[PDB]
């Protein structure tokens, strides 16, 4: 599974939320729904990763797997598959 | 559509295309505004827009992709890249980025990048792993750039004469000393066309500082490669910005193992602009020249090197003398002993009105054994020994007389042998 | 009857008009009040009244139509135009508007525009679809303005000498190096006379900065084209705004495929005014002049070009040297090599009373091949070869006495041979 | 035959009325009075057009096909012959 860069708007919104520390509402590609906080946007082995923690879980995921993200103060943005 | 082609179309076609899509009274403002309006109208339809540009990173941290058709002039059509994306891909100034753009949202004025799919003519991932320019070890030039076309035309003669006077290799550092009337512009145009013909793989950029608009237009028409220029009516900050954009683009291209050539007209006006913009350090030399100011043009000139790894950066910059201003004389005295190649033009030769007006006895190259072969080097030494006694006007007239019937340099050497 | 017709009408005929039309009071010396009353009465009769003016767009947003008769001076008789009409018809500074004019209402010191019927000698529909000036591609001057008249008098001697020394073409950026006393005004006057006589189609404009009213009046009387000037008593802002007026009008005229000629006496005074008006940028270069002060004079000078699409702009500027102020010298130094044609005036020849006092060895054009033919170029080559090695004042005596008994430059060229 | 542009005075009055965004009284050829607002004057093909949303019809009319307009805030205007 080769990784493709996400659109600039999605990454910019994610970085803004990360440095502003919002309780991000996340939905996975497989459909997993989770309320947690993104601590830092870190890229390892040329594929951009993201660490999201809820009660210290600090689980790692690829940015391609995230389809949409929402918060009360910002609109729900759906990433572009192409 | 693609933004680059839109920038390449003439103004009347732009007006027709805009009126086709419903824009009104767009024939009476800036071309950049026309492009911005038609791009916004097209993006309102929901189609994707493709665009490219060279990245300039401002002092705040965000960057702007500027186009080279407007000589990197700031305009509404410049693309905006946030600092988050400059952090994502390790982008430096001078990077040529191509990708998709999105229309500005509420509260935004400039178009914003949407997805990067080419960085410096390569993949976004691969261009991240390129070594920086100054980490590369410089070397003496050894790959000769031959200016002789060999078609036997009267335009080739100048190139041939130049090849006999001061050969150029890849990564050279040349200085063309130019009195006012002598045909410096003709020499630059001949060099540019010879580079475009003989060596198409080398990236060629022509930089003009404080040039008249008609000269800029005729150079953009004549030169096959890249021409960016700043007219004399523009402020000094414009000249400085265009020079730094050119040099960073060249450095980024060389980092990818590419030959780059920069023809500069002229280093004197660039130094004057840098003196104007740079604040005084308190130590003002003669002619109003500030010692701190000359530091940056010296960096521009010294960036020319032959990288030990693949690649090279040649810079051939002209310098004006006998201009009646102490500023130019001081700049010449500063820059005199810094060039690998030195080519002198003579006012009194052009007084007789024979071309090219090149001073043979005072023009040469440093470590010219590396560029040329042993036989050609010994032939050049023999010719230099023959030429030396004669005066410059007589030298040029005799050289041109002997260079007429011969078609190539080897035939000329053979004719001189007997 | 038109507003300008009553404006340039002197006292007797306007008084007769008032008394035959039925004006109650005719013992008022102030013409503004009687014009206002007579226009009010024309409005009351329902008879339409027309007018003409030149647009000025103030930074606040509305426009004022000034008049060229008062050298584009602000006054109560200027025609007010609201921003709505500026938004309807794409009109910027320099446009000339003629059409219906509405009398001022309660709350208007100035007459309000009613209906436009002509813009730039063109219908508004066709005037709204002309490309902007800086979108046009500059070019070298290819068609020359022959100033050699058939009069054969002593006035034609200066014109013939100027034709021989340095040809002038439409779209040429000119510069006149001159000492404080060289008879420059006579040279400018005869140049303007030749331009008006030989090329009536070309719009001739003469602008003076910081001049005494007497020569302003004599120029307005003796020059066939428009003459605009600013007296020395007026501040620098007046000169700045009048130069902006003339340059914007020239640009708007050029946009309509018209050849516009501007004589500028002098660039030194305009640069002085611009230096004095611009706020300081915090850094002052040698001579007490600001670095950014010269930027706007440079923009004014650089607007001269030969547009490829159609039309031309020929700016011929005079420069003053050795005036005793080093700021004038540095102004000339940053205005040194930006002009296509140059003409140097020598103080010594002026002292010797030789008219004209031009310098053959220090004058000439950048591209004589485009303007002239082949045989003309060779004859000029021969003349330059003859004159250059020897002196200049005696060369001028030679030139004037050689043009003495001859009438046509071709006959003189024949005589100078053998 | 020929199309003449309307005078600047009435045009600037009507655009001022549009800017003030007040209530508007409109009349038809038969003299029917309606309460609505003229949104904006659109300049297409060098010709001014006015769209009306009085009853949602969004009907388009040409600027030379209206005799005159009157408003309560300002004085009623009369279109001059020249």
Author numbering:
A (entry chain b), D (entry chain a): 3 to 84
B (entry chain B), C (entry chain A): 1 to 418
What does the paper say about this structure?
We subjected SEC fractions corresponding to ρ-Rof complexes to cryoEM/SPA in the absence and presence of the transition state analog, ADP-BeF3. Multi-particle 3D refinement with ~600,000 particle images yielded two cryoEM reconstructions for each sample, corresponding to two ρ-Rof assemblies. In the first assembly, ρ forms an open hexameric ring (ρA-ρF) bound by five Rof molecules (Rofa-Rofe), while the second assembly represents a ρ pentamer (ρA-ρE) bound by four Rof molecules (Rofa-Rofd). In the presence of ADP-BeF3, we obtained a ~1:1 (ρ6-Rof5:ρ5-Rof4) distribution between the two classes, whereas in the absence of the nucleotide, the equilibrium was shifted towards the lower oligomeric assembly (ρ6-Rof5:ρ5-Rof4 ~ 1:3). The reconstructions do not reveal differences in the ρ-Rof interfaces, irrespective of oligomeric state or bound nucleotide. The local resolutions of the reconstructions decrease towards the regions corresponding to terminal ρ subunits and bound Rof. Weaker density for the peripheral Rof molecules could indicate a higher flexibility or a lower occupancy. Rof molecules are bound between protomers ρA-ρB, ρB-ρC, etc., but not preceding or following the terminal ρ subunits, ρA and ρF.
